[PDB]
Amino acid sequence: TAYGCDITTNAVDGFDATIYQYNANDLRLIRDPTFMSTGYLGRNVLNKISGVTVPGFNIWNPSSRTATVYGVKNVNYYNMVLELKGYFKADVSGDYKLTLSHIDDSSMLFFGKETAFKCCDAGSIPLNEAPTDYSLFTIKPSNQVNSEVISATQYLEAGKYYPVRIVFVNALERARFDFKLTIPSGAVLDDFQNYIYQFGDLDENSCHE
Ligand SMILES: CC(=O)N[C@@H]1[C@@H](O)[C@H](O[C@@H]2O[C@H](CO)[C@@H](O)[C@H](O)[C@H]2NC(C)=O)[C@@H](CO)O[C@H]1O
Numbered sequence: 223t224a225y226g227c228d229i230t231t232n233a234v235d236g237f238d239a240t241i242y243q244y245n246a247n248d249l250r251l252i253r254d255p256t257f258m259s260t261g262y263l264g265r266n267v268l269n270k271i272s273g274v275t276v277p278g279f280n281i282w283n284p285s286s287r288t289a290t291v292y293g294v295k296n297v298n299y300y301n302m303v304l305e306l307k308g309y310f311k312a313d314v315s316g317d318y319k320l321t322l323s324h325i326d327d328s329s330m331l332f333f334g335k336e337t338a339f340k341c342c343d344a345g346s347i348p349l350n351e352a353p354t355d356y357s358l359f360t361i362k363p364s365n366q367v368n369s370e371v372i373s374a375t376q377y378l379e380a381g382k383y384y385p386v387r388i389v390f391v392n393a394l395e396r397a398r399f400d401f402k403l404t405i406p407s408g409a410v411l412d413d414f415q416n417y418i419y420q421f422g423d424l425d426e427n428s429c430h431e
């Protein structure tokens with residue numbers, strides 16, 4: 223019923239990142255759509271990181287299985303599942319494209335229809351969440367280059383919010399997660415600041431007076 227609210231002061235910038243354990247050298251599960259969509263959720267959580275506006279990275283240190291990822295030291299980039307979630311806000315109306323390029327090892331992207339809101343005095347509550355059907359699934363062929371560039375373009379309405387989830391797996395060595403946004407102007411962005419948000423929780427007893 224409401225796809226927006228006057229008061230959205232509880233919206234804050236950035237993807238929420240969750241990093242999970244993944245067995246080093248496992249080149250099977252990176253190709254398994256059930257694992258990439260749901261199965262990873264059963265693994266031990268290694269890190270939780272908020273406020274991420276630049277989600278892409280390309281990391282390979284032959285001398286260390288850890289690296290600084292999203293400002294956090296000693297992240298086990300060598301073998302991990304990364305889950306990024308948030309609400310994508312269209313600024314202007316038009317076609318927006320999300321592209322995954324040369325991913326090492328694999329990535330699956332989910333991008334939902336517009337979320338409805340419950341509007342409260344202290345901010346807005348998105349009602350819509352866990353888009354469950356993937357749009358894009360890209361996998362680096364074992365031991366050869368990932369030449370794949372895969373994209374999803376859809377029309378977004380100005381000011382509306384669209385839940386998004388991206389799952390990325392590195393099985394071993396290089397972690398290449400190249401995730402870009404093309405906006406209706408044609409500009410290609412690696413920085414999602416002012417497009418990607420979370421909504422802070424609020425006391426639902428005091429939603430209204
Ligand atoms: C059989 C073997 O060891 N081949 C080497 C490749 O593994 C290696 O590329 C690696 O492929 C993995 C599986 O697709 C990737 O997860 C991993 O990130 C990647 N490693 C790097 C450093 O890119 C290539 C790299 O040239 O060398 C082969 O000899």
Ligand SMILES: [Ca+2]
Pocket residue numbers: 326327392393394395396397398
């Ligand atoms: Ca890899």
